[PDB]
Amino acid sequence: DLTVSLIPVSGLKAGKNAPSAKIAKLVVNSTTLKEFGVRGISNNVVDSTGTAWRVAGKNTGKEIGVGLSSDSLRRSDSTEKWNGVNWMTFNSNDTLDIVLTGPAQNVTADTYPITLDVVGYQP
């Protein structure tokens, strides 16, 4: 099986953030599976692989753009299809960065939930 941790970054400050500011760390470990696919889950997924999406603040409803970092995307092993559905795959026993996507974002002080789906892949 897979052992998954999604770890929020400490010390994030409201206001103008750096481009690609790190906001969470995804940790996936396994003794049995060599790879995994991952997709973001929200009310507005914005690309064909589900690796960028938008999330809403609990107290304000304001949206921010989030996703895998450019560096993390370049570490993908492949993009595979599960009954026609794209999933980008990555090595198990590794970590990936979730970031604020695109150009610098001005983020309103709030709590923003992030949800990911992870599935084992045997290449």
Binding site: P8, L12, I23, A24, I114, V119, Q122
Partner: peptide
Amino acid sequence: GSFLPNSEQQKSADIVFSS
């Protein structure tokens, strides 16, 4: 290759931006 449907999991976390 193949996906392992029994291994699929959803994981969530709260990201906090403070004033």
